[PDB]
Symmetry: D2
Subunit: 228 residues, 4 copies
């Protein structure tokens, strides 16, 4: 390791890998308290710059590289895991913005977020894909399974949220083996993603990195979730 | 949303969630670009502080929270995918530090890393769990499968790396269907993790967050991989 | 000193003073390397936050404090030294934005800056106060003194810069003792300010802190110098 | 201005000047919210890095340049202004660490800081140079002038601080013209430096930049003031 880069390491940076940078410069990708950072060895070999590289078009190439190499892989993986799960559709199947939501039937903020989304969902801009969990209340699993068990689960969920949970249900005698697997898989993915509270909302940034909102979003966060 | 927190939002922060803070302060967890941020609403309710909260023992509580809820979770599921793969054990089964490495039999730097790890593996501190791939050379798949086919594949791999790849092998007539599945599964997981160069080394920080090293680690990164 | 604040000290912060903060919080003003920092002790007294406090109107109060008490004061006395020097007035005497420039008659970039400043000087927004020096060419002292010796030195300087240095002058037999004192005093003050290249341009920020530009400013710096 | 540097300017940076950097790179010195920053244009001309450059010996050359060009000139100027003022010596005239203190006779913390300094002063390591002011109490000017008027002012000040202000004085009928000038000059310099409270303590860092402490220093700040 070149001496200038060793000196930057002592400022609290752990190297991940080298990469090729412009202008004869050698790049080092690393982390500082778990955040990605970039170091550039100068052409002379005897200096190094810790910081952010921009190009002529004004792109922060260091941020682009950090996002591509550190954050995007795990985000794409979790996005696919949610896509392959047993989610309920709310909105148009071809709506261009996809938002995943982990929701419990006895969650007040879940219904409030449902309400917030209506202008985008009912205009075809956003589809919500709901992964039901049964974690808040003693009756949460049986009620979520009852929704999964109904003739049209996506419709029953819409009525359940729209009615504030006043929708009457025919709750089965037991949670079926298929319903237990759906709920336990969705709960596993929710726990993987680190939110213990519903709604747990996941969406993709324009840079293809996974983003999160937990609880009822404020106006700025809501508009970003919906793709404004 | 309180006016001081709205003001901080306008500096480029997107709020994820609220959380409980001490002293009658309310917390807001957010991000600036890719960086986690914590905001604390003052008891007067008319001010908010963006920064890092420390307790009496000197812990940076904001960093603990940001690591636990932002940086860490997305990689947890691929850590489990590595654990569920067909890895080879190098070290004690009860060694407290687990390190996964994606290695090709014809990778030079893999062998150098193997040697560098000896003090920690031999002490019982670290176990290396190797996920073989066959991606570098035409003979890489068959040689990797030959190691998997031997009577004690983990011992054969250790001897192979120790010998610098000179260890002679019984290379079977063909790659078995089980060996081909292992190699193809491992290669897909390696690709999903985002590093298509060996060695690709994965480990957990002292904050329990997934970390990566690609290529031969330098001395500082090696120490950190080994938990030292 | 409260334990959480001691913990922050150990991260490389040197405390300057305590100060009053809102909400029953105590403030500490300090520095990390050359950077000002504010720390706030929580009402619980067992936590402290290093960061930036905002109020309801969106003002960054920590930045206001850091600028007022750390970055600003040291330059205030040299701003007064410039005001007490023998400068030439270009613009209205009541123009609200004051800009000092150290200029040599044989400086090309000085003339380009003079032209760039015209819209603001002619509007009455900005007054340029020129402190002549004679440092570039053998004839620089005599030419500067000749401008000072003319019937209306400020007008002669404006015409000289406007002409690109082509304006013909009456250059006296010698530099008078008063002109030599002006030039030598101005050169010493220029040296004290730390820039030995002309134009050396000094102005006050909207935060009332002394600022410097050396050489011909680009468009953004020009706008900021001019108070725009 | 090269396009990559223009793009960094839009991140809130105001350019001061260019400078020559190593390895064919061009440097730009600027400020971000009144803090010095450095930008390096890459050899190709089509990228720029905002950040900190280190050399082989581990020196942060960006910090060195920022200190030399932005902070040190005004610090050296104020250091000289204090040196030329009418200060009172406390300690050995050849003590290697010099500390200036603005003090009022009716300031409790001034006497506490006096006490803190005794181990360094009485061993010849530190000299305190006290610039008296009369700003706190109605009798502060006459009492400070009485100390200045005494046969051995430095000794009378030592007795005054050591006795907790219990030292009896012969206060003259009026503040003399010479004493008024000393007090008003010292008050002007104190106001220049931005502290309205005594003790206002000024010392030089190892990097020849002016540093400040206001009020009674804590243990870390005290030891840094004294040159530990």
């Amino acid at each position: 390791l070149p001496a200038p880069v060793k000196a930057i390491e002592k400022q609290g940076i752990t190297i991940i890998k080298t990469f090729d940078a412009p202008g004869g410069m050698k790049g080092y990708l690393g982390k500082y308290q778990d955040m990605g950072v970039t170091i550039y060895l100068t052409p002379d070999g005897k200096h190094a710059i810790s910081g952010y590289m921009y190009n002529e078009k004004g792109e922060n190439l260091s941020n682009t590289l950090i996002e591509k190499e550190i954050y995007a892989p795990a985000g794409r993986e979790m996005w696919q895991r949610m896509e392959q799960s047993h989610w309920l559709l709310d909105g148009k199947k071809d709506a261009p913005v996809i938002v995943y939501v982990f929701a419990d039937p006895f969650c007040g903020p879940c219904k409030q977020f449902w309400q917030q989304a209506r202008p985008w969902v009912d205009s075809g801009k956003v589809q919500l894909r709901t992964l039901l969990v049964g974690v808040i209340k003693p009756e949460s699993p049986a009620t979520a399974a009852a929704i999964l068990a109904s003739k049209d689960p996506a419709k029953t969920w819409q009525q359940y949220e729209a009615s504030g949970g006043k929708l009457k249900l025919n709750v089965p005698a037991n949670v079926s083996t298929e319903q237990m697997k759906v709920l336990s898989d969705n709960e596993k993915l929710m726990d993987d993603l680190g939110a213990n509270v519903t709604p747990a909302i996941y969406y993709m940034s324009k840079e293809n990195t996974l983003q999160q909102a937990v609880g009822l979003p404020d106006q700025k966060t809501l508009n970003i979730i919906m793709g404004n």
